Amino acid sequence: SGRKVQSGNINAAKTIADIIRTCLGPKSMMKMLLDPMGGIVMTNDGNAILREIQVQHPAAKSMIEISRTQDEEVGDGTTSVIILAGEMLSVAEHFLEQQMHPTVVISAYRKALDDMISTLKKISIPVDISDSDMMLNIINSSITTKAISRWSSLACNIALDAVKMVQFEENGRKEIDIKKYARVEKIPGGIIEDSCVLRGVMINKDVTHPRMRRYIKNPRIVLLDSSLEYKKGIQQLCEDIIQLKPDVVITEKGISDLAQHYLMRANITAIRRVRKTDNNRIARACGARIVSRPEELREDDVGTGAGLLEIKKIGDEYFTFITDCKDPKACTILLRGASKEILSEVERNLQDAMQVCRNVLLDPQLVPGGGASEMAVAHALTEKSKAMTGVEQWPYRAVAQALEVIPRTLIQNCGASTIRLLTSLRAKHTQENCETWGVNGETGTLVDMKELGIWEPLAVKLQTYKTAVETAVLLLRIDDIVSGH
Amino acid sequence: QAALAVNISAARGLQDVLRTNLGPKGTMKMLVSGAGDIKLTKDGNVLLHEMQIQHPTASLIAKVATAQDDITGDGTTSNVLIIGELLKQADLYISEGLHPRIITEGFEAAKEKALQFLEEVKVSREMDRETLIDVARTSLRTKVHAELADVLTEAVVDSILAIKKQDEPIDLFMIEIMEMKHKSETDTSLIRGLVLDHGARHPDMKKRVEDAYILTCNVSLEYEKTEVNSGFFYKSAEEREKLVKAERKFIEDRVKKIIELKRKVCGDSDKGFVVINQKGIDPFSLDALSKEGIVALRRAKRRNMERLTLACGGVALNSFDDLSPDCLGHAGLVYEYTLGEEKFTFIEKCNNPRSVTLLIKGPNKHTLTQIKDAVRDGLRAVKNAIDDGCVVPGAGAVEVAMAEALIKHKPSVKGRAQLGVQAFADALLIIPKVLAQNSGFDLQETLVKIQAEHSESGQLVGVDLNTGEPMVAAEVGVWDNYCVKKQLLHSCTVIATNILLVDEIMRA
Amino acid sequence: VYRNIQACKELAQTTRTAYGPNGMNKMVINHLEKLFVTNDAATILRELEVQHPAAKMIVMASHMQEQEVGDGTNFVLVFAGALLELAEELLRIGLSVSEVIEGYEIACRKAHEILPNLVCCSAKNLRDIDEVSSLLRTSIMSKQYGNEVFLAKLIAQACVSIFPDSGHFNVDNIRVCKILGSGISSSSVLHGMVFKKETEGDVTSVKDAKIAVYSCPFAEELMNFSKGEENLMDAQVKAIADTGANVVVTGGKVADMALHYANKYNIMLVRLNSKWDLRRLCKTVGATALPRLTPPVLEEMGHCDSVYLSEVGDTQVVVFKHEKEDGAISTIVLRGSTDNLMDDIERAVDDGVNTFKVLTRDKRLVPGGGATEIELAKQITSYGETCPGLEQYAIKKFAEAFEAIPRALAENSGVKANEVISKLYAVHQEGNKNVGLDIEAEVPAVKDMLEAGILDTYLGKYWAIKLATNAAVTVLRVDQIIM
Ligand SMILES: Nc1ncnc2c1ncn2[C@@H]1O[C@H](COP(=O)(O)OP(=O)(O)O)[C@@H](O)[C@H]1O
Ligand SMILES: Nc1ncnc2c1ncn2[C@@H]1O[C@H](COP(=O)(O)OP(=O)(O)O)[C@@H](O)[C@H]1O
Ligand SMILES: Nc1ncnc2c1ncn2[C@@H]1O[C@H](COP(=O)(O)OP(=O)(O)O)[C@@H](O)[C@H]1O
């Protein structure tokens, strides 16, 4: 009753967070998943652990949801988000028992979050984009410690060629970017080096009889969801097309040979059995428009699409190589190899680096990882808390105290003592003016962070901190759960 | 088959219980009794003599260990740790056959090699004040607080260097620990000669005695009456009414005998005639004689009078009279000191000032007992260091080098005794490990560092119980006793063999 | 070891409430089934069934504290409890017990060396009855709230100021005599011990009194036995009256024949002596208890100055005054409706006299009411960041345990503790040492103590801090025992 439900919620949060507390870093301790069928599961990814496990407490369910969203939003750090949320709630437990309202606590947390957002940008080191040398250094730094160690060249070249092929200049300067409009073409065959990049959209569907001028010097794509029939006795679509005279028409169903000849008379190439998940990128790359009302038909129905079409047949597959289209917004990146067992994770890390590049365009800032950024922000909060007055200062210090959990876990899961190393790191970090030392993850030894050469994008760390703080305030703002079970 | 496993489990349990006591930085346990009074201590001897052990053979181990190592100074908990580790290491080989006799042969060969190694490692630096300081500090910081030990080291070392003049180690009577209950526990010094427990009812009789003559002889100022006639005072109480009288003539006889004794051997009211009574005395005759200059007191124990025989002089018979004053001796000062409410008589600067007593002012009973045990342990350790004349590098210095020597001695022995030798080395390796663990640092981090640096150092080297850094105990001041190591090794091997040779248990 | 820490924490918690002038008191029932109401924590502990050995030795430390100072024992208990709970969470962090011990020791030494830097000592001397009465009001106000503190300070201090000779004082000189009846406002102060006596046959002005101490108090054949018994009793009282005896003291009852015979001997037959009074009489008159009536001895015969009856207190009493010091003995007569508040009043009197004694032995006074506590906490926690190493955690935890005093003082007085703590700590940077808590306002308001005159002994707080640190250290360094 009353605060008891809050204590239960934060206890559930703490007991779900510490399950995968120890599984982040380059030496993550591995975990067991024992289904009640005798099977045994080998897993390191805490996200996979929580996805496989099931829990009944609704607060834990909401935290699972936020972890999944953060996984599907910016990329990595989900374990760090969960750990931060759990530690912040665990440290707020003491203040909840202190007979203070959750309102003052959450206000203090909000002010602390506002301070952290600024002090992160204060300490973040600038970075450059498209600078091959230290961009490749970042690739060897963070894009590594995955299964691309021996194959980092393909990942790096793919990322660097495909950074400038989904950029959207909607309201600024290429700051809008998506990782889904890119044409990833993951087909086995040949060597892994056969993967390449093309400026256009590729279709795995092709006409059964490509004995025709499938490519035109300036295709004018128009989306059409209707399927052509033999004739009106519908043929009227053929004359409707003839009115505006395009050269390429997309439909989702097959076209008969007689209908194919009718469309040849209509001076258009008919493409059949296309897919919506591919038609969307077709329209994005070609800027097509769909319209069927005769009154609304005008000169704007048909617009210029591709620039140089072509079709080849690689690996006995009916390919469709549209290249050099009008808009380099949905281009092609090829993915070939002997087997696909790792290339999926390769492309996942590719999209991770893609988010890295997109946020570098957003904010060219790197934060010193390995506990360096965490200790820097904790020190900034603790020194700023000296001037703060009132009861709300204690949470403003406890959030900083609980944020140092990341280096604590890094030191803990390498054998080294988690107390002496943390004390040495904190004591030397304060007297140091602008050093931002970060503990090595492998040896568990203190080292200046520039020498180690590890960094994270500013945006991803900022999002992790924001999500952790918002989860803390959301879980502390719950006053009761009784609505049934 | 299984009796061996039971003994192994009991020994491991005893070792685990006694793990967190070794070393000055090791934590201390506390003992609770049925009555309610509690004792707070860290020394292994008292812990094994006071613990209420469940397992029978664990009680056997404790009893035999205390009985054997009462001879040497200390090392009890280290011995228990080493025997437990020996048993565990032997079990790791017994679990796959390996009949215990072969392990016994390996243990005996390793004992011989370790004895020779200790013989050739022992350092015979000549005795001085500084080495005694170091030994006292090492033997005292492992039983009491840090600064209390630092204060007490000076007192104990000064007392011991005072004692050392006889060129022969003697103890017990010559060093006496007095106990009292002043609030300021910081007061702790040594007093030469003797200190008497208390005195009698005398208003400022002599105080500053200066030169004095000691006869004692259990004066009879309150000589025993004839009270006991039949049970108690019956209707025929005239016996206990009149026969109890007429014994005042004994008191007057003693008074006059002391009168001519004083004005025979002194000739003046000065030169206090020191006499004592084993029981109470009447204030009337007492102050009548004291006003003449006679130092008369009452109610003293035996140990003080036997010490007076060898440090002051004078015969002592309860039934007596004036006799030859040849046995009588002289005292430099018999000044009496009172702290608050109870009187102390300082019989100092006397003939043969070899006898010395130790003064402490503990606040309560348990701190007093711990201080007494700590100072006794320090005295025994420094006396043993005096006797051997060759101190050894402690802090695990001798143990790690012994282990290395045993490992390098492996191919020398034939048969399967090499397994026993290796287990013996791994068991002797426990001491630096327990030191590091009790200090707080990681076990194998410190152990690996120490072994790695000792590999090239050649000289012995220990562990610093402040940072985990390896340290040369010889140049710092950590020291142990040769006899302690000898007895520890021998008894450890004996008890390990005795336990390992067991085969089966039956009731009786 | 967490079992010992938790046990000591519960022990401290069960007496944390009774701290301060708003001590919200308890019920006391012992084995013989009395019912007392008391707020004095030292009074609470002495009938607590403490079984955990950690509790046994923490209350041993408390007893050592009261024997050296005389007040602040509840402060020692709560400080030790806070220290042990903070040590518990430090152990949960992963620190070793020895490192915590070292940090606590260095923090304690820092506290002792920083304490004398904020002392606002006494004004001029133990004299100036009004001034010292204003001084000695703080401890008695803590024991009993300000309803009667203004009268109590004068009543208690005026008695101890009677004999300011050669700068020496004794607490046992100022004893307390209780008289039932009228309210506390009718209390008074008198010279010489006051107690009940029975016979009024006493002359006002007397020469050197002769205190006769009673260690052991009181057809035809019937007439013969009665005559023999009466003659034997008359011989006994004649033997008592020998050696110039003029007064007697007895714990027995009066008899009409006995009182008549004593009166016609011109001796008052004083009876009804309390079971504690006789040792004090013997030790103050330089005599011992006579075994029976027939063996009195003039050598062990009581003499103080004289004996007479005092009507002060609306009752007839017996008074012995003008000892060898001629002014050393001075009791205090109290009035009250019942007896269940007499214990609290005499406890406040003791808490005044012992604080006066420690003022005599130390004329240095530091601000109270949460001032010195928060100041020392700020000093130690500021020094902690300067000191590197692993003792720093123990140093901050020591400061946090030190700052728990005003928290309890505010909480048990009604006001929310966190608001008071935060406001006091923030003010203390600018509103320096003399600031302190305000009892009166329900709102968490602060107020300077220099004008309020609420001060506590420097030496008392010094010894309390030292002994609390020693107790916490000696508790942390245990592992277990068979139980
Ligand atoms: N070589 C390294 N040295 C130190 N820390 C590292 C190293 N590599 C990675 N880390 C740490 O790992 C953390 C990122 O792990 P995380 O994003 O949680 O993985 P995932 O999100 O896939 O679970 C970073 O905070 C960084 O400090
Ligand atoms: N200052 C010190 N530094 C390192 N080791 C020490 C120090 N003082 C004592 N020791 C070690 O403690 C051991 C003795 O402790 P312990 O066995 O607990 O006492 P006891 O001899 O009573 O059993 C010695 O072997 C010595 O090496
Ligand atoms: N009017 C007051 N306002 C604030 N604090 C007070 C007041 N009166 C007493 N105190 C505090 O109460 C404490 C007295 O504690 P006390 O109850 O005497 O301990 P004990 O019961 O162990 O003798 C002092 O430290 C003082 O700071």
The Cα B215–Cα B194 span in angstroms is 15
Q: Under 8 Å CB-to-CB from A133, ≥6 apart: which residues?
A: none
- Residue C370 and residue C449 in contact, taking contact as beta carbons nearer than 8 Å: no
- Asked if the Cβ–Cβ distance from C422 to A391 is below 8 Å, we say yes
The Cα A315–Cα A63 span in angstroms is 46
CA neighbor of C70 nearest in space, from C20, C164, C139, C126: C139
- Residue B331 and residue B215 in contact, taking contact as beta carbons nearer than 8 Å: no
Instruction: Determine the angle formed by the axes of helices C97-114 and C458-476, rounding to 10 degrees.
Output: 170
Nearest C-alpha to atom 17 of ligand 1 is from which residue? Answer: A77
Q: Under 8 Å CB-to-CB from B300, ≥6 apart: which residues?
A: B196, B197, B276, B277, B278
Chains that touch A (3 or more CB pairs under 8 A): C
CA-nearest residue to C424 within chain A is A390
Torsion of the alpha carbons at A106, A110, A113 and A119, rounded to the nearest 10: -130
Q: Which helix (H) or strand (E) covers residue B286, if one does? A: helix B283-290
Q: After which residues is chain C broken (C to N over 2.5 A)?
A: 218
Other C-beta atoms closer than 10 Å to the C-beta of A256 total 14
Tally C-beta pairs within 8 A across B and C.
Answer: 39
- Residue B218 and residue B277 in contact, taking contact as beta carbons nearer than 8 Å: yes
The Cα A325–Cα C122 span in angstroms is 95
Candidates C390, C403, C427: best to mutate against A (most CBs of A within 10 A) is: C390
- Residue A456 and residue A465 in contact, taking contact as beta carbons nearer than 8 Å: no
What are residue B275's DSSP bridge partners?
Answer: B296
- Residue C404 and residue C375 in contact, taking contact as beta carbons nearer than 8 Å: no
Tell me, using a 6 A CB cutoff, whether residue A373 lines ligand 1: no
Task: Write out chain A residues lying below 8 Å of C397, CB-based.
Answer: none
Smallest Cα distance from A430 to chain C, Å: 10
The Cα A376–Cα A365 span in angstroms is 15
Q: Does C400 lie at the interface with B, CB-CB under 8 angstroms?
A: no
Resolution to 1 decimal, in Å? 3.7
Task: Write out chain A residues lying below 8 Å of C393, CB-based.
Answer: 423
- Residue C280 and residue C252 in contact, taking contact as beta carbons nearer than 8 Å: no
Candidates B14, B16, B20, B27: best to mutate against C (most CBs of C within 10 A) is: B27
CA neighbor of B254 nearest in space, from B288, B226, B227, B214: B288
Instruction: Determine the angle formed by the axes of helices A3-17 and A78-97, rounding to 10 degrees.
Output: 150
Identify whether B77 is a catalytic site residue.
yes
The Cα B474–Cα B124 span in angstroms is 11
Tell me, using a 6 A CB cutoff, whether residue A454 lines ligand 1: yes
Instruction: Determine the angle formed by the axes of helices A458-476 and A78-97, rounding to 10 degrees.
Output: 40
- The SS3 assignment for B319 reads coil
Other C-beta atoms closer than 10 Å to the C-beta of C122 total 15
- Residue B493 and residue B107 in contact, taking contact as beta carbons nearer than 8 Å: yes
Identify whether B20 is a catalytic site residue.
no
Q: Which C positions 64-83 lie with beta carbon below 8 A of chain B?
A: 64, 68
Could you tell me the strand order of the sheet in which A269-271 lies?
A221-223, A248-250, A269-271
The CB-side HSE value for C38 (13 A sphere, CA atoms) comes to: 23
The Cα B93–Cα B74 span in angstroms is 31
The Cα C189–Cα C176 span in angstroms is 10
Other C-beta atoms closer than 10 Å to the C-beta of B98 total 17
The Cα C350–Cα C354 span in angstroms is 6
User: DSSP letter at A146?
Assistant: S
What are residue B336's DSSP bridge partners?
Answer: B345
CA neighbor of C281 nearest in space, from C215, C234, C333: C215
Chains that touch C (3 or more CB pairs under 8 A): A, B
Q: Buried b / exposed e across C235-271, counting CB within 10 Å, b at 16+?
A: ebbeebbeeebbbbbbbeebeeebbebbeebebbbbb
User: Is residue A146 a known part of a binding site?
Assistant: yes
Supply A91's token pair: 């440290």
The Cα A29–Cα A409 span in angstroms is 11
The Cα A80–Cα A408 span in angstroms is 12
Please provide the distance, in angstroms rounded to a whole number, between the alpha carbons at the two ends of chain B: 20
The Cα B468–Cα B450 span in angstroms is 9
Closest Cβ–Cβ partner in B32, B364, B439 for C53? B32
- The SS3 assignment for A378 reads helix
Q: Under 8 Å CB-to-CB from A479, ≥6 apart: which residues?
A: A5, A6, A102
Residue ranges at the known binding site of B for ADP: 23, 75-78, 142-143, 395, 480
Max Cα separation, chain B?
94
Please provide the distance, in angstroms rounded to a whole number, between the alpha carbons at the two ends of chain C: 13
- Residue B292 and residue B259 in contact, taking contact as beta carbons nearer than 8 Å: yes
CA angle (A391 as vertex; A387, A393 as ends), nearest 5: 40
The Cα B81–Cα B62 span in angstroms is 12
- The SS3 assignment for A353 reads helix
User: DSSP letter at B316?
Assistant: -
- Residue B208 and residue B189 in contact, taking contact as beta carbons nearer than 8 Å: no
Nearest C-alpha to atom 13 of ligand 1 is from which residue? Answer: A25
**Complete DSSP assignment for A213-247:** ----SS--EEE--S---S----THHHHHHHHH--S
What are residue C435's DSSP bridge partners?
Answer: C448
Query: Which residue shows structure tokens 């002599």?
Result: B206
Query: Which residue shows structure tokens 């998943």?
Result: A33
Q: Buried b / exposed e across A185-195, counting CB within 10 Å, b at 16+?
A: bebeeeebeeb
- Residue C77 and residue A401 in contact, taking contact as beta carbons nearer than 8 Å: no
Report H helices in A98-248: 102-123, 132-141, 152-162, 236-244
| SS3 annotation, chain C | CHHHHHHHHHHHHHHHCCCCCCCCCEEECCCCCCCEEECCHHHHHCCCCCCCHHHHHHHHHHHHHHHHCCCCHHHHHHHHHHHHHHHHHHHHHCCCHHHHHHHHHHHHHHHHHHHHHHCCCCCCCCCCHHHHHHHCHHHHHHHCCCCCHHHHHHHHHHHHCCCCCCCCCCHHHCCEEEEECCCHHHCEECCEEEEECCCCCCCCCCCCCCEEEECCCCCHHHHHHHHHHHHHHHHHHHHHCCCCCCEEEECCCCCHHHHHHHHHCCCCCCCCCCCCHHHHHHHHHCCCCCCCCCCCCCCCCECCCCEECCCCCCCCEEEECCCCCCCCCECEEEEECCCCCHHHHHHHHHHHHHHHHHHHHCCCEEECCCHHHHHHHHHHHHHHHHCCCCHHHHHHHHHHHHCHHHHHHHHCCCCCHHHHHHHHHHHHHHCCCCEEECCCCCCCCEEEHHHHCCEEEHHHHHHHHHHHHHHHHHHHCCCCCCC
The Cα B64–Cα B248 span in angstroms is 56
The CB-side HSE value for B283 (13 A sphere, CA atoms) comes to: 6
Give phi and psi for C447, each to the nearest 5: -160, 145
Q: Which B positions 354-413 lie with beta carbon below 8 A of chain C?
A: 363-364
The Cα C343–Cα A65 span in angstroms is 65
Backbone φ/ψ region at C461: left (φ over 0), alpha (ψ -120 to 50), beta: alpha
Could you tell me the strand order of the sheet in which B356-360 lies?
B175-178, B356-360, B188-192
- Asked if the Cβ–Cβ distance from C418 to A418 is below 8 Å, we say no
- The SS3 assignment for A467 reads helix
Supply A251's token pair: 């439909």
Question: Which residues form ligand 3's pocket by a CB distance below 6 Å?
Answer: C 19-21, 40-42, 71-75, 138-139, 141-142, 351, 368-369, 409, 437, 439, 454, 456
The Cα B456–Cα B106 span in angstroms is 28
CA-nearest residue to C420 within chain A is A391
Strand pairing class (A125-126; A365-368): antiparallel
Q: Under 8 Å CB-to-CB from C143, ≥6 apart: which residues?
A: C21, C23, C39, C40, C344, C347, C348, C351
Supply B310's token pair: 């060898």
- The SS3 assignment for B229 reads coil
Q: How far is CA A323 from CA A163, A183, A210, A320, B348, in A?
A: 17, 12, 18, 10, 114
Torsion of the alpha carbons at C99, C105, C106 and C110, rounded to the nearest 10: 150
The Cα B94–Cα B91 span in angstroms is 5
Other C-beta atoms closer than 10 Å to the C-beta of C73 total 25
Q: How far is CA C11 from CA A297, C104, C401, C410, in A?
A: 89, 21, 16, 20
Q: What share of chain B is helix, strand, coil (3-state, %, to 5)?
A: 50, 10, 35
Tell me, using a 6 A CB cutoff, whether residue B44 lines ligand 2: yes
- Asked if the Cβ–Cβ distance from B27 to C98 is below 8 Å, we say yes
Give phi and psi for B205, each to the nearest 5: -75, -60
The Cα A444–Cα B243 span in angstroms is 94
The Cα A245–Cα B310 span in angstroms is 136
The Cα C149–Cα C156 span in angstroms is 10
CA angle (A434 as vertex; A431, A435 as ends), nearest 5: 80
Nearest C-alpha to atom 27 of ligand 1 is from which residue? Answer: A370
Smallest Cα distance from C53 to chain B, Å: 8
- The SS3 assignment for B17 reads helix
What amino acid is encoded at B482 in this protein? Y
The Cα C266–Cα C207 span in angstroms is 14
What are residue C436's DSSP bridge partners?
Answer: C447
Closest Cβ–Cβ partner in C60, C68, C98 for B25? C98
Torsion of the alpha carbons at C465, C470, C473 and C474, rounded to the nearest 10: -150
- Residue C77 and residue C58 in contact, taking contact as beta carbons nearer than 8 Å: yes
- The SS3 assignment for B374 reads helix
CA neighbor of A64 nearest in space, from A51, A80, A45, A77: A51
Tell me, using a 6 A CB cutoff, whether residue A77 lines ligand 1: yes
Supply B162's token pair: 């005072």
- Residue A147 and residue A345 in contact, taking contact as beta carbons nearer than 8 Å: yes
Q: Under 8 Å CB-to-CB from B180, ≥6 apart: which residues?
A: B339, B342, B344, B360, B361, B362
What are residue B480's DSSP bridge partners?
Answer: B392
CA-nearest residue to A385 within chain C is C426
CA neighbor of C354 nearest in space, from C190, C138, C178, C148: C138
The Cα C72–Cα A427 span in angstroms is 37
Report H helices in B18-69: 44-50, 56-69
Please provide the distance, in angstroms rounded to a whole number, between the alpha carbons at the two ends of chain A: 15
- The SS3 assignment for A418 reads coil
CA-nearest residue to B465 within chain C is C98
User: Is residue A409 a known part of a binding site?
Assistant: no
Supply A140's token pair: 């060897």
Max Cα separation, chain A?
89
The Cα A146–Cα A12 span in angstroms is 32
